[PDB]
């Protein structure tokens, strides 16, 4: 009867970003607001597995949070642990997210660089989590091409 | 090369009279020059799914097992996990290309949620796809049908 | 600065090929040289898990080797073990390599056959490994579309890490 309002927690994974410099977290808020959704939780967490997992679970336990969106901490180096940290908490991995994110990035944005891109999405109970790279461009593509178009559908399916 | 296939429709609600996808699989195979040697609608639970796949594997006149239905992102959708546990080697390109093609040529972003898996079991192969006839049609026309002969040939060498 | 010269080891997985008939190994060398890179190690290894892993680790331990590139031994049958053999050694798998390799192969070269193609890329310490099918067409695509464009950046990222 009306565009469902999805409530989300934004998590920016970085050892250096602050509220004044968190461009990607700010972008996530603007994209969600414009799409008719709401941000009910936001925090910048240190870049380590335990901090990331704690932030995701904190969002999960918040009554007014339906989805957890994280950005940053991804990469091919040993110090990049976002994907592994989040993967460990997922009930079911929505593999199509990471796959299509890379495919679309390759064809429409960064080309071959997308080969090194890492992203993951999945469910935890009746809620969902999407973890994307930290650049604003990665965030914008993932949100506009994949997440925003499906948020309402996913939450609906998980709550039924 | 007339590949023999078993068709498994995973559903708690479909019947022979309403199984569109199972019927479509029949038609697509027939038109392609292949044959259906086994068919059944099995309840939607992990054990019924696995038993149906293994039943096809153990049938002398079944080269390939094709299943449709039971997929999804919810807790009660277990097809991919049920079938994955039985595979010797996963043909990862099936699920991947199925989603890529679906995204580009059909359902767009909805494909991000689509689930499908293919792989080998001994000298046989299994392909599990979503339950809608559209998913079945795309998977068969774009990926499975053109490769059935090639795969069975490679596995029987 | 200047185009960094990456040092690579070429591994051809085969029970029949010889240095004279190794068409794919020769192609890899050519592509790398024209791209400004260098081959500091090369060997044709028998097609079995243990030989493949040994050849990859030998490359890792070689002081003047930054990247290991293997071709051959891939397939969907039980006797094709390259991907599983290499996968067991990787610290972190660069999933985008295999995925994009198949996607591009589908769209530009072999269509549906790409569904059966197998390839894997990943890191071992501060070094990287890419394993691709043995056909010249597979090698050409993997190298031109994905590896060559990113070699410099990858090694750079891993050297600093």
UniProtKB/Swiss-Prot annotation, chain A:
In terms of CDD domains, this protein maps to: MogA_MoaB
What are the cysteine partners in each disulfide bond? none
UniProt keywords, alphabetically: Molybdenum cofactor biosynthesis
Q: How does it assemble?
A: Homotrimer.
Q: Which Gene3D superfamilies match?
A: MoaB/Mog-like domain (3.40.980.10)
The protein depicted here goes by the name: Molybdenum cofactor biosynthesis protein B
Organism equals Bacillus cereus (strain ATCC 14579 / DSM 31 / CCUG 7414 / JCM 2152 / NBRC 15305 / NCIMB 9373 / NCTC 2599 / NRRL B-3711)
PROSITE patterns, from UniProt?
MOCF_BIOSYNTHESIS_1
- What pathway does the annotation place this protein in? Cofactor biosynthesis; molybdopterin biosynthesis
| Stated family | Belongs to the MoaB/Mog family.
What cellular component GO annotations does this protein have? cytosol
Q: What does this protein do?
A: May be involved in the biosynthesis of molybdopterin.
One of the GO biological process terms: Mo-molybdopterin cofactor biosynthetic process
UniProt KW Phosphoprotein keyword: no
